[PDB]
Amino acid sequence: PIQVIEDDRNNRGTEPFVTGVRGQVPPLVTTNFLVKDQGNASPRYIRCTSYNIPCTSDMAKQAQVPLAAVIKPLARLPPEEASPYVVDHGESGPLRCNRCKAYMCPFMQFIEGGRRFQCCFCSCINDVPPQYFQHLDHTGKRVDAYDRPELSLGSYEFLATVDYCKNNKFPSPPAFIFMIDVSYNAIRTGLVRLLCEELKSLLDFLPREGGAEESAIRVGFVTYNKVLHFYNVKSSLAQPQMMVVSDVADMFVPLLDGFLVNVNESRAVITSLLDQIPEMFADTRETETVFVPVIQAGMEALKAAECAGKLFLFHTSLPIAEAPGKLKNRDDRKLINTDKEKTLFQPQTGAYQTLAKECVAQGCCVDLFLFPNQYVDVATLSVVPQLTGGSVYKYASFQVENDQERFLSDLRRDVQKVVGFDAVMRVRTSTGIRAVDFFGAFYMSNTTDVELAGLDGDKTVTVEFKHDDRLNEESGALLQCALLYTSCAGQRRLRIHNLALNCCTQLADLYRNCETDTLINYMAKFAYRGVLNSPVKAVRDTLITQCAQILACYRKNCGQLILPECMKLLPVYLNCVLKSDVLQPGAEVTTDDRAYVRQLVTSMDVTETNVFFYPRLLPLTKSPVESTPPAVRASEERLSNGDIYLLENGLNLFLWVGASVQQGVVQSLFSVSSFSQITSGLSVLPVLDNPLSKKVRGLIDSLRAQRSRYMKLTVVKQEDKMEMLFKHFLVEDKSLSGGASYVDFLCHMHKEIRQLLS
Ligand SMILES: [Zn+2]
Question: Any idea which positions bind Zn(2+)?
Answer without folding.
Answer: 97, 100, 119, 122
